[PDB]
Subunit: 312 residues, 3 copies
């Protein structure tokens, strides 16, 4: 199609730059400047809104394209093959076109607010400046093709079941774990501290399992889960804690997403994460909250998962 | 005997409830409500007094019964066999009967003071309520049989050697390590943070080695060590630190207990604990005190253990 | 030679004491009393000045003697063989004689200022007092022989290249990493907390690789690197941070030292250290500074090492 053909031209203009970027740099785990949790949450919210509006089949295709790309990484910089680079850009171009322009610009505007003005210059300083410029020009040409195919209105909200077994169980899980949820420091920078002894390539293989799971999940269930998070962000208090009702809706929605893929797909994610998560991490998190409430939340979770397991 | 026969009936009434309890829940490592170190210490003191008054042979028998019970654990809830459940209840019933009623009630009263009123309800909410009630009724019947065989007066204090080699060495160890003892935060909740990466079943196998060692130890030496701790609790200051003289008496008493079992029994405990203790734990403890005093205490300990080793 | 012959007599008088010292005691990692970072830095500075003035070939010989001595350690106290003890004392005696008396006394005076008056007594209390006294008398006799051979003037400063590839690269590394250097708490006691799960004998084998590397390094490059550190100490601010220019000079000097030994020698040090450094240590250090600046410093380092690698 058009976007696919345009992606090939984008590749001719940008692959040199892609080969120069040090993709294994740990700096990408950090905020693009000073961390501002609540301001960053507004940007995440715009992305969630956009994700919920995008075509589920195109999102699925874009996830598969990244899974394929991870398989061809090579060299010390961790760059994917030229064919995969084009495949990813085409798939993302299609996703962008499935959403109205204002949604895309909202993301750009909110991310700009939290990005330090010096970030682009520092990033360009690590590569060949001419190649970066050449890549950007390629991008400007590519976005015109995407724009021509872009829709003018957003698709409607997902269908949410009511009173299903998962929804009822999620209510019990939520009441039991809300005290624990309120104790977590949602505004801490600890979440961006790296995993001890794990390289970027090791982390990538674990993230790959999640990408694969997302590609397999029910598109509507995923869309509803994103919508539930957007609503939850609207009710947060000053410390970032959402309302008990919105928390319950988020848990029910996630339970339906889990039940939409086979058990083996979910276990692959768990096993991969268990391989990269130092045992001191769960302990460090546990030590910052009330130990009775953490155990109450955990017991409720192991009870809730039996209902999800039966539906799955 | 009577208690043995009554334990079998207690089992018919309570084993269903025992099978329902999730014994692997980590909540049991936590205080039954808000942690109140000094108030909890009063309850531990009542238990120590009771332990020192109990018949040493019956305490030994009850420890052996638990060691046997650990060997038959099965299922996801970690429940011991019906035969072992009865064996444990009978052995404990006999221990309770070897101590006067007021001592037993003192424990109950002091533990009630630190237990949150909502604890029993929360525990009952996780099992079949009817089965719990049935188990409690079984307990009320069982305690009447125990009461009929209960002594009316407490046995006398243990015999403590004087000026033996261990007692003299303990004096040197105590003088050398008291500065370190004073620096430890005895009122901290860090002691109840779980062992990183260790399941309840793994911890249980390590605790089993200690139970085995206790069953092998000299009953009089154990009794004297408990009495020494009761005295030490009497002289604590506002931060929970006992007097130097009481500390020395505790060290001498523990040294005698160690020398009452063969070296292999003590090494089995050490090796099992080494297997479940993350190397960051000793470091975390060390970092909270004066490093010179911790090394002075450690050097004194490695010197003291040579005297215990020779006596053993 | 004279010092060699005198070392043999020193050995007859001191080896008994050497066998009694518990060399595996972790107390030697701690300051000899209360930690006083800035006062201790003055003592290190005197040692640096002395090291830069000593004969490079004699320093190299003394390093080799320690490497040999590590190979003959035996027993629970970690004592080297009698032959190696003498070899070490002789080699050190020769180093001491290659430097003027005032430099040696300066070290003694500055170390005395930070050492608690009770340290010698505590150390003597752990060994046979008569043997310690006998060893000290042996030392007093030995130092007279060293004194007779001692030079009267210090050798001149090392020759430093200018505008070489390493020097230019060091400038870029220093500019990129200075913000990170300023954020580190140079006055913290964390640097003296032990390595989790690593015995003194395990640490010794890792330190052995560094001793071997130092013995292989270019004597002039080492001398220049020591001189660069002495200058750097002169420009520190109140928090212990040296000037940007002195920092750059230190980096260039160290880069030349690294390029003066083959790659395999440097990798042996890295592999040995990787074996004793818990993965939580780099994380703990990273969590105390700005994460963006740490990643910028790291990226700059991986770029700088390519220039060192080519020169090597
Ligand atoms: C644990 C939690 C998980 C984490 C959560 C997710 C993390 C979210 C944070 C992501 C951080 C993104 C930061 C990367 C910055 C890259 C933006 C870029 O370099 O920006 C470069 C631009 C270009 O600047 C240029 O500056 C000038 C130079 O161009 C000139 O030069 C020539 C080519 O060289 C051309 O011919 C051009 O026409 C000519 O004018 C011109 O004005 C250009 O038109 C242009 O404006 O800078 C600008 O716009 C201004 C800067 C804008 C700020 C960044 C927003 C834009 C892109 C990000 C939004 C997408 C969302 C990302 C996250 C979603 C997925 C994770
Ligand atoms: C550790 C490691 O190894 O990680 C490895 C992981 C991988 C995955 C293997 C890997 C890879 C590949 C990667 C990351 C590729 C990333 C590609 C990103 C493409 C992003 C695109 C196209 C974004 C857009 C946004 C658009 C917006 C367009 C508009 O808003 C514009 C402008 C103006 C509006 O008026 C109109 C508009 C039309 C609305 C556009 O049209 O397109 C790599 C490199 O190997 C690294
Ligand atoms: C198309 C699209 O865009 O997709 C995008 C969609 C998203 C959602 C945005 C996205 C994402 C993120 C994803 C998928 C997250 C996935 C999370 C999965 C979590 C799974 C968990 C917790 C699984 C487990 C399994 C466990 C098992 C525990 C036990 O067995 C144990 C050990 C021992 C037994 O004795 C008992 C037991 C208790 C039984 C456990 O306890 O937990 C992504 C990647 O961006 C892609
Ligand atoms: C900065 C900021 O303020 O952020 C704010 C952002 C928000 C969004 C507003 C906000 C919020 C709400 C949040 C985060 C809620 C998160 C909820 C997460 C729920 C996750 C769930 C249910 C995961 C699972 C995984 C499951 C796996 C089940 C199985 O694998 C198991 C075990 C065993 C297998 O044998 C069977 C199986 C079935 C395969 C399951 O059953 O369920 C908050 C708190 O306000 C913070
Ligand atoms: C992680 C894990 O797997 O852990 C596993 C570990 C094991 C060991 C294998 C295991 C097990 C077994 C367990 C815990 C059994 C516990 C049994 C406890 C029995 C307690 C008893 C009888 C207590 C009492 C107290 C009494 C008091 C009586 C009186 O005061 C009363 C009322 C009134 C006074 O007027 C008179 C009185 C007479 C003075 C009584 O008479 O009796 C299990 C379940 O498998 C879990
Ligand atoms: C009937 C009854 O009720 O019984 C009850 C009685 C109690 C008491 C209440 C009870 C209990 C608790 C018990 C038993 C506690 C037992 C504690 C044992 C501690 C043992 C220790 C520290 C052993 C060691 C061994 C070590 C060895 C170190 C070395 O070898 C090492 C590595 C390397 C060599 O080169 C040097 C070395 C230095 C030689 C070490 O350094 O330490 C229980 C369970 O409730 C039951
Ligand atoms: C909250 C509250 O306030 O709590 C307060 C409670 C108190 C009680 C009032 C209180 C107090 C005092 C306390 C805790 C004192 C604790 C003393 C513990 C002493 C432990 C000892 C000696 C253990 C051992 C183990 C030994 C093992 C020896 C061997 O294995 C070794 C190595 C090697 C083998 O080859 C040979 C061996 C021989 C087999 C040994 O030789 O000795 C305080 C501080 O006030 C706090
Ligand atoms: C964990 C472990 O196992 O570690 C193991 C590591 C090893 C290396 C294997 C090991 C070993 C060996 C060791 C440490 C040996 C150390 C020897 C130290 C010797 C130091 C010497 C001679 C120092 C001096 C200083 C002198 C100063 C002399 C003067 O100033 C004096 C007075 C007065 C002035 O007027 C004149 C003067 C002339 C200027 C002197 O003349 O001599 C061991 C023991 O096995 C432990
Ligand atoms: C005669 C005399 O007195 O000598 C005295 C002289 C001194 C100087 C005072 C002295 C001393 C101290 C000494 C020698 C210090 C030595 C320090 C050596 C540091 C070496 C380092 C950092 C080496 C590395 C190697 C690395 C490799 C990283 C990578 O390969 C990795 C993993 C993975 C690849 O994919 C990428 C990669 C990135 C390539 C790394 O990242 O770092 C001593 C002992 O007192 C003796
Ligand atoms: C208490 C107090 O205040 O202290 C004050 C003391 C001071 C001194 C005044 C002060 C200061 C300055 C300081 C500490 C600066 C320290 C700089 C250290 C630089 C170390 C460097 C360059 C090490 C290396 C190692 C290298 C290894 C390279 C390789 O192995 C690599 C990777 C991979 C192989 O394949 C190839 C290779 C080539 C073999 C290299 O390339 O470089 C400060 C800050 O003021 C604090
Ligand atoms: C159901 C579900 O799971 O959904 C999940 C799905 C996902 C995908 C996993 C997910 C996600 C992430 C999301 C949506 C990412 C969104 C990315 C959006 C990028 C937008 C970009 C780059 C927009 C712009 C706009 C630009 C404008 C540039 C110009 O106008 C400017 C200024 C000025 C000049 O005059 C002209 C110009 C030069 C043209 C441009 O430069 O770029 C999420 C949140 O997890 C939800
Ligand atoms: C030498 C040495 O090593 O000793 C060591 C030995 C050990 C064993 C390891 C050790 C230990 C722990 C110890 C001693 C545990 C003691 C447990 C005691 C439990 C006591 C209980 C349950 C008592 C009660 C009383 C109750 C009363 C109930 C009723 O009256 C009530 C309210 C009102 C109604 O009208 C009638 C009623 C319903 C009848 C009941 O409900 O329960 C220690 C401390 O380590 C020392
Ligand atoms: C190029 C490079 O890499 O260099 C590196 C090389 C090294 C070696 C690795 C290095 C290092 C460390 C250094 C230099 C160590 C220096 C040690 C010096 C020790 C000096 C001592 C013991 C001096 C004294 C003086 C004393 C005086 C005693 C007496 O006068 C007293 C009071 C009073 C009586 O009346 C007479 C008396 C009894 C006679 C004595 O008792 O002892 C460094 C810093 O890393 C740099």
């Amino acid at each position: 199609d058009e976007i696919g053909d345009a992606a090939k031209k984008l590749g001719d203009a940008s692959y040199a730059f892609a080969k120069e970027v040090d993709w294994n740099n740990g700096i990408f785990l950090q905020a693009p400047g000073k961390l501002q949790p609540l301001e960053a949450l507004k940007a995440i919210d715009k992305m969630i809104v956009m994700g919920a509006a995008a075509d589920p089949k195109l999102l699925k295709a874009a996830a598969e394209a990244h899974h394929k790309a991870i398989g061809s990484i090579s060299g010390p910089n961790g760059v994917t093959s030229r064919a995969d680079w084009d495949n990813v850009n085409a798939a993302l171009g299609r996703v962008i076109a499935s959403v109205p322009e204002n949604m895309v610009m909202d993301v750009y505007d909110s991310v700009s607010k939290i990005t330090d003005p010096k970030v682009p210059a520092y990033m360009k300083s690590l590569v060949n400046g001419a190649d970066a410029e050449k890549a950007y020009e390629g991008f400007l040409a590519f976005k015109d093709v995407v724009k021509k195919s872009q829709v003018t209105s957003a698709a409607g909200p997902a269908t949410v079941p009511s009173g299903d077994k998962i929804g009822v169980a999620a209510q019990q899980l939520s009441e039991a774990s809300y005290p624990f949820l309120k104790e977590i420091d949602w505004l801490s920078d600890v979440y961006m501290k790296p995993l001890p002894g794990v390289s970027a390539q090791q982390s990538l293989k674990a993230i790959d399992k999640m990408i694969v799971m997302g590609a397999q999940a029910d598109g509507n269930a995923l869309k509803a889960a994103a919508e539930a998070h957007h609503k939850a962000i609207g009710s947060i208090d000053a410390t970032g804690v959402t309302s008990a009702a919105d928390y319950a809706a988020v848990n029910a929605a996630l339970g339906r997403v889990i039940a939409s893929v086979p058990k083996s797909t979910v276990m692959d994610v768990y096993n991969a994460m268990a391989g990269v998560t130092d045992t001191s991490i769960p302990l460090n998190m546990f030590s910052k909250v009330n130990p009775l409430d953490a155990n109450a939340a955990a017991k409720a979770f192991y009870t809730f998962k039996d209902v999800v397991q039966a539906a799955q």
